[PDB]
Write a protein that binds this ligand. Structure first.
Ligand SMILES: COc1cccc(C(=O)N2CCCC2)c1
Ligand SMILES: [Mn+2]
Ligand SMILES: [Mn+2]
Lengths: 137, 137
């Protein structure tokens, strides 16, 4: 039986700017680095950056909707978004759903998100206003 | 600050087979589906499957090393991996370069992994068998 997400691994084209982005800009804790990768944590999340020459710096119009959302409190959301904006981090989508969300790109074009709110909160909102064809289990 | 992974969203080309893969084959909990997506949980992980006409079924030699690992206990690991193998689930990696792991593909070629062990355990193992150039902070 699977008990949760063990780790998220992102392929990166250049290790140093990716470490700077996740550790310094996004505030994650750097635990180890080697010639071809790094391990960071963000709360319970174990993040691995893996140096991969096959990683392309990918414009957001050229990748699908797969994305990684990090939790932040409502109280901290606006100042963190402003930090990303000051750093010139590109946005790939505007928020149109429930709960605050900021959609931003990493140096290689990985699609990231800041989101406020849990699955339970989303399901409660959906019960009141179900999406087209929505069924609950 | 950021406190962990709020959710993982995977773009999928065909919703029903992807829901079946994560719910029936991997045992995740299905909470809701709709015409264009589904919400599942795996322990504390919120997984969203999002129907995306841009998603392509991607062979593993065409994608980079970005991947998603799910936690499983030492007692359950081998029989779960063997069940996926017997079910014909495609693979993408054989060499255990990061501990006890089984590497497999979802229907769209998303790179998945079963892994036994925490970040702390991986750091302790790496102190004895470090990756080239490894430094610990
Ligand atoms: C909305 O929940 C479900 C569950 C199982 C299947 C489906 C679905 O796509 N169908 C069922 C009738 C034909 C199309 C939806
Ligand atoms: Mn999202
Ligand atoms: Mn892994």
């Amino acid at each position: 039986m699977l008990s949760g997400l063990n780790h998220l691994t992102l392929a990166v084209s250049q290790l140093a700017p990716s470490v700077a982005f996740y550790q310094q800009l996004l505030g994650m804790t750097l635990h180890a680095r080697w010639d071809s990768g790094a391990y960071l944590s963000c709360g319970d999340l174990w993040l691995c950056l893996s140096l991969d020459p096959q990683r392309r710096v990918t414009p957001p119009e050229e990748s699908d909707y797969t994305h990684y959302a990090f939790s932040i409190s409502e109280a901290d959301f606006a100042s963190f978004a402003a930090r990303l904006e000051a750093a010139g981090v590109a946005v790939w989508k505007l928020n149109r759903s429930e709960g605050a969300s900021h959609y931003f790109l990493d140096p290689d074009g990985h699609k990231l998100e800041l989101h406020v709110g849990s699955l339970a909160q989303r399901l409660a909102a959906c019960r009141e206003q179900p999406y087209k064809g929505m069924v609950f289990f």
